[PDB]
Write a protein that binds this ligand. Structure first.
Ligand code: NAG
Ligand code: NAG
Ligand code: NAG
Ligand code: NAG
Ligand code: NAG
Ligand code: NAG
Ligand code: NAG
Lengths: 962, 36
């Protein structure tokens, strides 16, 4: 039979206490929900380890071997009802053996074998195979030295066998220190998303996780038609050589060169190759090889090198300082000594001094400026077109697809290049056909999820591909992020952003929820599913233009809206010697060589810290005098109880401010007892406490409700609230009688809007997303900075104390220099990004100060500056790191249609309205204001006369009262 | 010499190690010499 191993067989990775962490590690783990083969005693393979479990006493011991005969060592881990016995001999009597160890319900084991060690882990659990999660602890590792490719149980019969694979797990550690939960980061797209964001519960949105590749299939080698074997025998085993002043040069071409007859022997005294290595010469393909052969003294062979001095390398034989080639000499004749001037490289002169001798041969490789001729024995294969392969064209390697081309090469050219030095076309050395080279498919991978509290389904966007490509690559199992439990399905949709696998296409346009790209969104609609539509810009209407009709409102409504303004962020200092070095002194002296880094960095961070307090002072400290909150909070019917503090409570905040402070959900050292951390990171406290900001906003609300608008320009002057509201109605263009006659209705609409503001903040909707975004960005910057202290940047370890306790001084200098360089770079990145984010926060605080001046201390005429409507009055409330503005506006809401005229002609002269419009009641002509319907009779007081009535287009006849 | 733009292609490089400081033509119109 076969069963599944659901979340079983996880073990403790190492021997270190951890608590309240999530830990990402790579080891050999049994993947989640994989197959097991239950037995109800065959020889079973042992590949990279197993997972053995036995539900029933009757099973005891194992035999781990290679051949399972008397010709290979085999280990027996048996139990004689009291003693665990381990032996490693040639069993079938035993002989010739090197290990011995005797020592004094579901049982579970993991056997792993690596580096000549057999790790064994064991767990126990009291209950086919169950479905729980259980964790395994180590028992013993044994220093055996044998391969294990088979195993067999020993019975004196219900056991299951899994198989381990190299995976990545994210392990959750308790507060006590035990592993309670884990995710397999290669099982689903969602599990990869959980591992990449390092959390178990994902929010809603679109997230980028990894990148995809299309792996190669074939392999293409093309080499020229060269058959003749190559004559190094003539060049090397030759009877006579010329003198060093008259060296000879021999050209080698159209030969297949072995090169293994030079470095397989001790025949040569020296073997120095420049620009290549000896072992790599059997794959490269050169154009011609030249051999310079001569005879020279013993202690002058060192002189034959790039950049030497003397007589041989000065008047006899000079090499250039870009030499690609090999220099040979072995134990076995004049030489020039006087001439006028130096030599140019590879030039000879035909004053001579006579000469243990050595024979020297110098090989220079002509590298691929022409068709290649001289290269080693590699086989050639046919070429594969329109497919991702690995190629090798005369030593020129790579990976990509090959396509017929339309370029036209000159006969002396062998390949074609690009701007960043990529070969993008090539000539086939056999058929002389031009091929283009393209990359295989790659890009990013996005995971679209509706939160991991409403579904566990996701969709995947493969960015910027045609996805018959990724459909065929998935079905042929050829993508690098290959997920074990994942089916493409029948929902594959091509967009301009790439293509979308897992979301279905509907024809109904909705407002955008999760944006994907070029007009496409996704959402979670009706079970439910993930849909993908074209976004809708707005809800349509039609208003009919006519040349003699106007629409005038017949009522209104009061609306209170909200604005969230971030103002400041959290203030940070870092100890540069504690982050970079710690307690060490060799590190301190080594870091002293870099000038002023830490002084300059502390200066930058201090400036950011001072700027945050300046922002807060600029927004809130805008009043000269502190007005006390009134005893009675009922001004003409307007209830101010929810925006002013209550004397019957211990705190200064109001009730809405309490909601706002509960809304935002806010390591490193900081204090309030005062603790510190080993990384040298703190957070500094602000100059103005929450109580002082609450005192500011309380005095602003009190001064508004008592003096109105007059304290932003001079001293405050008291005025009853209804007369203040009548002046504000007058300022938006409505007469005061509209207030005074409908005062009760306006008070009721105010109170109801305040109650809805309260209830919508209690509802736990994320209206405060900006202040949360401030919190999140700062925390993730500091987490990246602390996590950068685990990398070693090339050193043997990332710990300075290990390097300093296990190594001498002279190499500890090298390792500490590498760690110092990497950590200076990490701190520089942190400070640069903090400066840019401080600029953002300062612009936002400047806007908030402009709004407090122009909307709390006045009445603004600017359209949509302070709410949506006609602005009346506005109120400030404090939040964590911000301010919330409660704008009160006037909305004209009902309509009627009327017939209108520009002027009316009475006797011979035309009358125009003073302030208003002429409307037709249905019976007679009245005059009314624009923003409310209040018809008045047309008199001489509210009209003016200018001209004759023959010139205005659309003038009518009506009487005008005197 | 006519005025214009013309482009030249390589024909052969020779691995001969003498130095050249003088040259001379061989005859049986005119010829012009510039310096690189
Ligand atoms: C931790 O250990 C204590 C025993 O001191 C136990 O009561 C508790 O359940 C354990 N687990 C957690 C999560 O605290
Ligand atoms: C080339 O040969 C001439 C012979 O007249 C000599 O003057 C010159 O120095 C030589 N070139 C070099 C680099 O020595
Ligand atoms: C190389 O050899 C192959 C197989 O013999 C032949 O088809 C091809 O024409 C040859 N090309 C050249 C350039 O010699
Ligand atoms: C506006 O509507 C309300 C509905 O409650 C009504 O009481 C009020 O009289 C209306 N105003 C006018 C001017 O008709
Ligand atoms: C003002 O509002 C508060 C909160 O709803 C309420 O308790 C109080 O009674 C109101 N004041 C009145 C109705 O005078
Ligand atoms: C026109 O005005 C008169 C004045 O009282 C009013 O009675 C009548 O209802 C108005 N006409 C319409 C159609 O409302
Ligand atoms: C208004 O009255 C005058 C008086 O003569 C007349 O000429 C004119 O046509 C009248 N307007 C209309 C639209 O009938």
């Amino acid at each position: 039979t076969q069963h599944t191993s659901s979340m079983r067989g996880v073990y403790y990775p190492d021997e270190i206490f951890r608590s309240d962490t999530l830990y990402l590690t790579q080891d050999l783990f049994l993947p989640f929900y994989s197959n097991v083969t239950g037995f109800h005693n065959p020889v079973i393979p042992f590949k990279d380890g197993i997972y053995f479990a036995a539900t029933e006493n009757v099973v005891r011991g194992w035999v781990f071997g290679s051949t399972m005969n008397n010709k290979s060592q085999s280990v027996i881990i048996i139990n004689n009802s009291t003693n665990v016995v381990i032996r490693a001999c040639n069993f079938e009597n035993a002989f010739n053996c090197t290990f011995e160890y005797i020592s004094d319900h579901l049982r579970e084991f993991v056997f792993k074998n690596k580096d000549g060690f057999l790790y064994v882990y064991k767990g126990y659990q009291p209950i086919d195979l169950p479905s729980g999660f259980n964790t395994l602890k180590p028992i013993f590792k044994l220093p055996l030295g044998i391969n294990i490719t088979n195993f067999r149980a020993i019975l004196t019969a219900a056991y299951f066998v899994g198989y381990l694979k190299p995976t990545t797990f994210m392990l959750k550690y308790d507060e006590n220190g035990t592993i309670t939960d884990a995710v397999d980061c290669s099982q689903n797209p969602l599990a990869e998303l959980k591992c990449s964001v390092k959390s178990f519960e994902i929010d809603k949105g679109i997230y980028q996780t990894s990148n995809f590749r299309v792996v190669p299939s074939g392999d293409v080698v093309r080499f020229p038609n060269i058959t003749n074997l190559c004559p190094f025998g003539e060049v090397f085993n030759a009877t006579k050589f010329p003198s060093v002043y008259a060296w000879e040069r021999k050209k080698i071409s159209n030969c297949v060169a072995d090169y293994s007859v030079l470095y397989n022997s001790t025949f040569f005294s020296t073997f120095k190759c420049y620009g290549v290595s000896a072992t790599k010469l059997n794959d490269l393909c050169f154009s011609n090889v030249y051999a310079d052969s001569f005879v020279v003294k013993g202690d002058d062979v060192r002189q034959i090198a790039p950049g030497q001095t003397g007589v041989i390398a000065d008047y006899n034989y000079k090499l250039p300082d870009d030499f690609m080639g090999c220099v040979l000499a072995w134990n076995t004749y004049k030489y020039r000594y006087l001439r006028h001037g130096k030599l140019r490289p590879f030039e000879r002169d035909i004053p001579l001094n006579d000469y243990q001798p050595y024979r020297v041969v110098v090989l220079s490789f002509e590298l691929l400026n022409a068709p290649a001729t001289v290269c080693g024995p590699k086989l050639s294969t046919d070429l594969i077109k329109n497919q991702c392969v690995n190629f090798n064209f005369n030593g020129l390697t790579g990976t990509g697809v090959l396509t017929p081309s339309s370029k036209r090469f000159q006969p002396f050219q062998q390949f074609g290049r690009d701007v960043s030095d990529f070969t993008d076309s090539v000539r086939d050395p056999k058929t002389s056909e031009i091929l283009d080279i393209s990359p295989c498919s790659f890009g990013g991978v996005s995971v679209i999820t509706p939160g991991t509290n409403a579904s566990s389904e996701v969709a995947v966007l493969y960015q910027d591909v045609n996805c018959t490509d990724v459909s065929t690559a998935i079905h042929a199992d050829q993508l690098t992020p290959a997920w074990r439990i994942y089916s493409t399905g029948n929902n594959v949709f091509q967009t301009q952003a790439g293509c979308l696998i897992g979301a279905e296409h509907v024809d109904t346009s909705y407002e955008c929820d999760i944006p994907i790209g070029a007009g496409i969104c996704a959402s979670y609609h009706t079970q439910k599913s993930i849909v993908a539509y074209t976004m809708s810009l707005g809800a349509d209407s039609s208003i009919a233009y006519s040349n003699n009709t106007i629409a005038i409102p017949t009522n209104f409504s009061i609306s209170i809206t909200t604005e969230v303004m971030p103002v400041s962020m959290a203030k940070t200092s870092v100890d540069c010697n504690m982050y970079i070095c710690g307690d060490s002194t060799e590190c301190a002296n080594l870091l002293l060589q870099y000038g002023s880094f830490c002084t300059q960095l502390n200066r930058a961070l201090s400036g950011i810290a001072a700027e945050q307090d300046r922002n807060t002072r600029e927004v809130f400290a805008q009043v000269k005098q502190m007005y006390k909150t009134p005893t009675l909070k009922y001004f003409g019917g307007f209830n101010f109880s929810q925006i002013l503090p209550d004397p019957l409570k211990p705190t200064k905040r109001s009730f809405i401010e309490d909601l706002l402070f509960n809304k935002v959900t806010l390591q490193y050292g900081e204090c309030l007892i005062c603790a510190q951390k080993f990384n040298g990171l703190t957070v500094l406290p602000p100059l103005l406490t929450d109580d002082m900001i609450a005192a500011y906003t309380a005095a602003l609300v009190s001064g508004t409700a008592t003096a109105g608008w007059t304290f932003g320009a001079g001293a405050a002057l008291q005025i009853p609230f209804a007369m203040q509201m009548a002046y504000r109605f007058n300022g938006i263009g409505v007469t005061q009688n509209v207030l005074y006659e409908n005062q009760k209705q306006i008070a009721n609409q105010f109170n109801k809007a305040i109650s809805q503001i309260q209830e919508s903040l209690t509802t736990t909707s994320t209206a405060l997303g900006k202040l949360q975004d401030v919190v999140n960005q700062n925390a993730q910057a500091l987490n990246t900075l602390v996590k950068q202290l685990s990398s070693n940047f090339g050193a043997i370890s990332s710990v300075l104390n290990d390097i300093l306790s296990r190594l001498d001084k002279v190499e500890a200098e090298v390792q500490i220099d590498r760690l110092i360089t990497g950590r200076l770079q990490s701190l520089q990145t942190y400070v640069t990004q903090q400066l840019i984010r401080a600029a953002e926060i300062r612009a936002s605080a400047n806007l908030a100060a402009t709004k407090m001046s122009e909307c709390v201390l006045g009445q603004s005429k600017r359209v949509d500056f302070c709410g949506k409507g006609y602005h009346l009055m506005s109120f400030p409330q404090a939040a964590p790191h911000g301010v919330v503005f409660l704008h009160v506006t006037y909305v004209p809401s009902q309509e009627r249609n009327f017939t209108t005229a520009p002027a009316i002609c009475h006797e011979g002269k035309a009358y125009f309205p003073r302030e208003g419009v002429f409307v037709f009641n249905g019976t007679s002509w009245f005059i009314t204001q624009r923003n409310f319907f209040s018809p008045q009779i047309i008199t001489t007081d509210n009209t003016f006369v200018s001209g004759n009535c023959d010139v205005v287009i659309g003038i009518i006849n009506n009487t005008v009262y005197d």
